[PDB]
Amino acid sequence: GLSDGEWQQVLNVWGKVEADIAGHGQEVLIRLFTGHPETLEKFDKFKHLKTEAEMKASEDLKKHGTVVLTALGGILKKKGHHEAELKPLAQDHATKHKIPIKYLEFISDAIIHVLHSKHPGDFGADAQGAMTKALELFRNDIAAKYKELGFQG
Ligand code: HEM
């Protein structure tokens, strides 16, 4: 898992995100959808959005961005002792939404990208290292539940 020092870095960084969760949430989803258009098809809600400009102008998209980072923040705050919160999330993303673990990889990368874009020079080597590991742990725990359910993707 992560050391206490590492968890401290993750929650310090999360402080940056909480100052503007909708702004961070929206840019994450944009990065995802533009870098991997197939992911947009999973949302009936945003499949109409072709252009990035349209994406930028969607208040609905911003709303979902908020929903997503609120859920993620709640899990990160548990520092690994997140079974309770994570299982239900894993079960609906596999059975209901039908999201392959590769798309969780993609969003993980989108988060790191956004953190550097919005905090250039403010998101250092130790911080990036800790956040990367935290997102890997998150993905790994999801992968365990996906395996139980036999969801391939
Ligand atoms: C940081 C990773 C993610 C988090 C924390 C997250 C969280 C959530 C939450 C809290 C909801 C609403 C309740 C539910 O239906 O389960 C949701 C809905 C959904 N998620 Fe995710 N999600 C993540 C990644 C993804 C990815 C990568 C995709 C697809 C590329 C995706 C696809 C969807 C869809 C299609 C819905 C239904 C939304 C609607 O139309 O109302 N999720 N997600």
SSE order and pairing:
Elements: H1 4-18, H2 21-35, H3 52-57, H4 59-76, H5 83-95, H6 101-118, H7 125-149
Helix pairs in contact: 1-7, 2-4, 2-6, 5-7, 6-7
The chain binds protoporphyrin IX containing FE.
Modified residues (Phosphoserine): 3
Keywords: Cytoplasm, Heme, Iron, Metal-binding, Muscle protein, Oxidoreductase, Oxygen transport, Phosphoprotein, Transport
Domain Globin: 1-147
From the N-terminal CA to the C-terminal CA, the straight-line distance is 27 Å
Domain count, please report it.
1
Text of the CATH class: Mainly Alpha
The computed structural class is: mainly alpha
**Tally of helical runs:** 7
The small molecules bound here are:
protoporphyrin IX containing FE
CATH architecture descriptor text: Orthogonal Bundle
Rounded to an integer in angstroms, the radius of gyration calculated over CA atoms is 15 Å
User: How would you name the oligomeric state of the polypeptide chains in this document?
Assistant: monomer
Q: Helicity level, as a percent range?
A: over 70%
What's the total number of strands?
0
Please state roughly what percent of the residues sit in beta strands, choosing from under 5%, 5-15%, 15-25%, 25-35%, 35-45% or over 45%: under 5%
SSE order, one letter for each helix or strand: HHHHHHH
General form: globular
The CATH superfamily name is Globins
Main sheet summary: none
CATH topology: Globin-like
PDB class: oxygen transport
Keywords: heme, oxygen transport, respiratory protein
Assembly: monomeric
Entry title: myoglobin (horse heart) mutant with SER 92 replaced by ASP (S92D)
